[PDB]
CSV table of C-alpha atoms and ligand atoms in Angstrom, one decimal:
chain,number,residue,atom,x,y,z
H,1,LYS,CA,95.4,59.1,213.1
H,2,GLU,CA,96.1,59.1,209.4
H,3,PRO,CA,99.7,60.3,208.9
H,4,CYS,CA,101.0,62.9,206.5
H,5,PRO,CA,103.6,60.8,204.7
H,6,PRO,CA,106.7,62.6,203.5
H,7,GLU,CA,106.8,63.4,199.9
H,8,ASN,CA,109.8,61.5,198.2
H,9,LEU,CA,110.8,59.0,200.8
H,10,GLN,CA,113.3,56.5,199.3
H,11,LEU,CA,112.7,53.0,200.5
H,12,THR,CA,116.1,51.5,199.7
H,13,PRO,CA,116.2,47.8,198.6
H,14,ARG,CA,117.4,45.6,201.5
H,15,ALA,CA,116.8,48.3,204.0
H,16,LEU,CA,114.6,45.7,205.8
H,17,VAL,CA,116.8,42.7,205.6
H,18,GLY,CA,117.3,40.8,208.9
H,19,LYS,CA,115.9,40.7,212.5
H,20,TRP,CA,113.4,43.3,213.8
H,21,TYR,CA,111.3,43.5,217.0
H,22,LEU,CA,107.9,45.0,216.6
H,23,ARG,CA,107.7,46.7,220.0
H,24,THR,CA,105.4,49.8,219.5
H,25,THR,CA,102.1,50.4,217.9
H,26,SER,CA,99.2,52.7,217.5
H,27,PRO,CA,96.7,51.7,218.4
H,28,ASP,CA,98.1,49.2,221.0
H,29,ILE,CA,97.8,45.6,219.8
H,30,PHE,CA,99.8,44.0,222.5
H,31,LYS,CA,96.9,42.5,224.5
H,32,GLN,CA,96.1,40.3,221.5
H,33,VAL,CA,99.6,39.4,220.3
H,34,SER,CA,103.1,39.9,221.9
H,35,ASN,CA,106.9,39.2,221.7
H,36,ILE,CA,107.0,39.9,218.0
H,37,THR,CA,110.2,39.0,216.2
H,38,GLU,CA,110.5,39.3,212.4
H,39,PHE,CA,113.2,38.0,210.1
H,40,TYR,CA,113.4,39.1,206.5
H,41,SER,CA,115.4,38.0,203.5
H,42,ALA,CA,115.8,39.8,200.3
H,43,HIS,CA,114.3,38.4,197.2
H,44,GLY,CA,115.2,41.1,194.7
H,45,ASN,CA,113.2,44.2,195.7
H,46,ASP,CA,110.8,42.1,197.8
H,47,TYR,CA,111.2,40.1,201.0
H,48,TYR,CA,110.2,36.8,202.5
H,49,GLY,CA,110.7,35.5,206.0
H,50,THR,CA,109.3,34.6,209.4
H,51,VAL,CA,107.3,36.3,212.2
H,52,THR,CA,107.2,34.6,215.6
H,53,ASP,CA,104.9,35.9,218.3
H,54,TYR,CA,103.3,34.8,221.4
H,55,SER,CA,99.5,34.2,221.0
H,56,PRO,CA,97.4,34.3,224.1
H,57,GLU,CA,95.6,31.3,222.6
H,58,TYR,CA,98.5,29.4,220.9
H,59,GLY,CA,101.6,30.4,222.7
H,60,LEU,CA,104.8,30.8,220.7
H,61,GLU,CA,103.9,30.3,217.0
H,62,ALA,CA,105.7,31.0,213.8
H,63,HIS,CA,104.3,32.3,210.5
H,64,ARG,CA,105.7,32.6,207.0
H,65,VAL,CA,105.3,36.2,205.6
H,66,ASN,CA,105.8,37.9,202.3
H,67,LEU,CA,106.6,41.5,201.6
H,68,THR,CA,106.0,42.7,198.1
H,69,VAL,CA,107.5,46.2,197.6
H,70,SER,CA,106.3,48.9,195.3
H,71,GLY,CA,107.8,52.4,195.7
H,72,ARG,CA,107.0,53.2,199.3
H,73,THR,CA,104.1,50.8,199.9
H,74,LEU,CA,104.2,47.1,200.4
H,75,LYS,CA,101.9,44.2,200.7
H,76,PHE,CA,102.2,42.3,203.9
H,77,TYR,CA,100.8,38.7,203.6
H,78,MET,CA,101.0,36.0,206.3
H,79,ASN,CA,100.6,32.3,205.5
H,80,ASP,CA,98.1,31.0,208.1
H,81,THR,CA,96.3,34.1,209.5
H,82,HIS,CA,95.3,37.2,207.6
H,83,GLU,CA,94.3,39.7,210.2
H,84,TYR,CA,97.4,41.8,209.6
H,85,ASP,CA,97.4,41.4,205.8
H,86,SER,CA,97.4,44.8,204.1
H,87,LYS,CA,99.0,47.4,202.0
H,88,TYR,CA,101.4,49.3,204.3
H,89,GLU,CA,102.9,52.7,203.7
H,90,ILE,CA,106.5,53.4,204.9
H,91,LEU,CA,106.6,56.5,207.1
H,92,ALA,CA,110.3,56.4,208.0
H,93,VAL,CA,113.3,54.0,207.6
H,94,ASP,CA,116.6,54.3,209.5
H,95,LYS,CA,119.4,51.9,210.4
H,96,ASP,CA,117.7,51.2,213.8
H,97,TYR,CA,114.0,51.3,213.1
H,98,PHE,CA,111.2,51.4,210.5
H,99,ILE,CA,107.6,52.6,210.6
H,100,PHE,CA,104.7,51.3,208.5
H,101,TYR,CA,101.1,52.3,208.2
H,102,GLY,CA,98.2,50.2,206.9
H,103,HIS,CA,94.6,49.1,207.5
H,104,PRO,CA,94.6,45.5,208.1
H,105,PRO,CA,91.4,43.7,209.2
H,106,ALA,CA,92.7,43.7,212.8
H,107,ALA,CA,92.7,47.6,212.7
H,108,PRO,CA,90.8,48.8,209.6
H,109,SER,CA,90.9,52.5,210.6
H,110,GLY,CA,94.7,52.4,210.7
H,111,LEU,CA,97.6,50.8,212.3
H,112,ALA,CA,101.1,52.3,212.7
H,113,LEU,CA,103.8,49.8,213.5
H,114,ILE,CA,107.4,50.6,214.8
H,115,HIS,CA,110.0,47.9,214.2
H,116,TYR,CA,113.3,48.1,215.9
H,117,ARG,CA,116.7,46.7,215.3
H,118,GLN,CA,117.0,46.3,219.1
H,119,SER,CA,114.7,44.4,221.5
H,120,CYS,CA,114.7,47.2,224.1
H,121,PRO,CA,115.8,50.2,222.1
H,122,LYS,CA,117.7,53.0,223.8
H,123,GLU,CA,116.7,56.6,224.4
H,124,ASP,CA,118.6,58.1,221.4
H,125,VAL,CA,116.8,55.6,219.1
H,126,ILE,CA,113.5,56.4,220.8
H,127,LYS,CA,114.1,60.2,220.5
H,128,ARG,CA,114.7,59.8,216.8
H,129,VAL,CA,111.4,57.8,216.5
H,130,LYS,CA,109.6,60.6,218.3
H,131,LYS,CA,111.0,63.1,215.8
H,132,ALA,CA,110.2,60.9,212.8
H,133,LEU,CA,106.6,60.5,214.0
H,134,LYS,CA,106.0,64.3,214.6
H,135,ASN,CA,107.3,64.9,211.1
H,136,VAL,CA,104.6,62.6,209.6
H,137,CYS,CA,101.8,64.1,211.8
H,138,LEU,CA,101.8,61.4,214.4
H,139,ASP,CA,102.6,61.5,218.1
H,140,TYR,CA,104.5,59.0,220.1
H,141,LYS,CA,102.1,59.6,223.1
H,142,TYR,CA,99.4,57.7,221.4
H,143,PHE,CA,101.5,54.5,220.8
H,144,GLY,CA,101.5,51.5,223.1
H,145,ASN,CA,104.6,49.4,223.9
H,146,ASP,CA,104.9,45.6,224.2
H,147,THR,CA,105.2,45.5,228.0
H,148,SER,CA,105.4,41.7,228.2
H,149,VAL,CA,109.1,42.1,227.0
H,150,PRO,CA,111.2,43.0,230.0
H,151,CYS,CA,113.1,46.2,229.3
H,152,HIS,CA,113.6,47.3,232.9
H,153,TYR,CA,114.7,45.6,236.1
O,201,LIG,C1,110.0,35.5,222.6
O,201,LIG,O1,110.5,35.3,221.3
O,201,LIG,C2,111.7,34.5,221.2
O,201,LIG,C3,112.2,34.5,219.8
O,201,LIG,O2,112.9,35.8,219.8
O,201,LIG,C4,111.6,33.1,221.8
O,201,LIG,O3,112.8,32.5,221.8
O,201,LIG,C5,113.0,31.3,221.0
O,201,LIG,O4,112.4,30.2,221.6
O,201,LIG,C6,112.5,29.0,220.9
O,201,LIG,C7,111.8,28.0,221.7
O,201,LIG,O5,112.1,28.2,223.1
O,201,LIG,C8,114.0,28.6,220.7
O,201,LIG,O6,114.1,27.3,220.0
O,201,LIG,C9,114.7,29.8,220.0
O,201,LIG,O7,116.1,29.6,220.0
O,201,LIG,C10,114.5,31.1,220.7
O,201,LIG,N1,115.1,32.2,220.1
O,201,LIG,C11,116.0,33.1,220.7
O,201,LIG,C12,116.4,34.2,219.8
O,201,LIG,O8,116.4,33.0,221.8
O,201,LIG,C13,111.1,33.3,223.2
O,201,LIG,O9,110.8,32.0,223.7
O,201,LIG,C14,109.8,34.1,223.3
O,201,LIG,N2,109.4,34.3,224.6
O,201,LIG,C15,108.1,34.3,225.0
O,201,LIG,C16,107.7,34.4,226.4
O,201,LIG,O10,107.2,34.2,224.1
O,202,LIG,C1,102.9,28.7,208.2
O,202,LIG,O1,104.2,29.0,208.6
O,202,LIG,C2,105.0,28.1,209.3
O,202,LIG,C3,106.4,28.1,208.6
O,202,LIG,O2,107.4,28.2,209.4
O,202,LIG,C4,104.6,26.6,209.3
O,202,LIG,O3,105.1,26.0,210.5
O,202,LIG,C5,105.8,24.8,210.2
O,202,LIG,O4,105.0,23.6,210.3
O,202,LIG,C6,105.6,22.4,209.9
O,202,LIG,C7,104.6,21.3,209.6
O,202,LIG,O5,103.8,21.8,208.6
O,202,LIG,C8,106.5,22.1,211.1
O,202,LIG,O6,107.2,20.9,210.9
O,202,LIG,C9,107.6,23.2,211.3
O,202,LIG,O7,108.3,23.0,212.5
O,202,LIG,C10,106.9,24.6,211.3
O,202,LIG,N1,108.0,25.5,211.0
O,202,LIG,C11,108.3,26.5,211.9
O,202,LIG,C12,109.4,27.4,211.4
O,202,LIG,O8,107.7,26.7,212.9
O,202,LIG,C13,103.1,26.4,209.2
O,202,LIG,O9,102.9,25.1,208.8
O,202,LIG,C14,102.6,27.2,208.0
O,202,LIG,N2,101.1,27.0,208.0
O,202,LIG,C15,100.4,26.8,206.9
O,202,LIG,C16,98.9,26.6,207.1
O,202,LIG,O10,100.8,26.9,205.7
O,203,NAG,C1,107.5,53.0,225.6
O,203,NAG,O1,108.7,52.7,226.2
O,203,NAG,C2,109.7,53.8,226.3
O,203,NAG,C3,111.0,53.3,226.8
O,203,NAG,O2,110.8,52.5,228.0
O,203,NAG,C4,109.1,54.9,227.1
O,203,NAG,O3,110.0,56.1,227.2
O,203,NAG,C5,107.7,55.3,226.6
O,203,NAG,O4,107.1,56.2,227.4
O,203,NAG,C6,106.8,54.1,226.4
O,203,NAG,N1,105.5,54.5,225.9
O,203,NAG,C7,104.4,54.4,226.7
O,203,NAG,C8,103.0,54.9,226.1
O,203,NAG,O5,104.4,53.9,227.8
């Protein structure tokens, strides 16, 4: 689904600094890539850093990424594979999560990506994400989780 982004969402500089786990997605991308960790460093209003992920073909790999920010959209570019490379629009930022939306070659009709401060986020964080989604015309029901990361005993 195309979202209805909110009207004057501030994307604060450095709001994306540090470690994130990309655990939830629409549509579900986790049968092709999994265990996704991102680490960003500020470079003025932009970021640069690293994405590590487990590839069914390659195992644990690392990639250099750049985020080039412009208002509320950014350009995601990865160094050695470009299937996720796109303009992404910020749908929500928060201390504990952020939500992007783009059309990379791997999902050219639209890909929403939820990144979390926590590997296995707790229910209060999840409830907020649910609320943030409904408020941009999306629904958490239609997202898939990275189930290869164990969040339950
Ligand atoms: C899932 O991702 C993590 C990174 O979060 C992998 O852990 C790293 O593994 C390398 C090689 O074992 C170590 O040198 C790093 O120290 C590890 N990082 C952390 C934060 O522990 C982990 O191996 C991945 N697991 C799978 C199954 O892909
Ligand atoms: C894309 O990104 C990663 C950067 O981390 C590169 O992986 C490194 O490759 C070098 C040799 O070229 C290894 O010595 C390092 O251990 C790797 N670093 C990490 C953090 O894993 C990879 O080479 C880059 N690929 C291209 C094609 O530019
Ligand atoms: C994703 O995981 C959360 C927390 O475990 C859960 O409540 C939610 O139902 C999951 N979504 C799907 C589609 O399984």
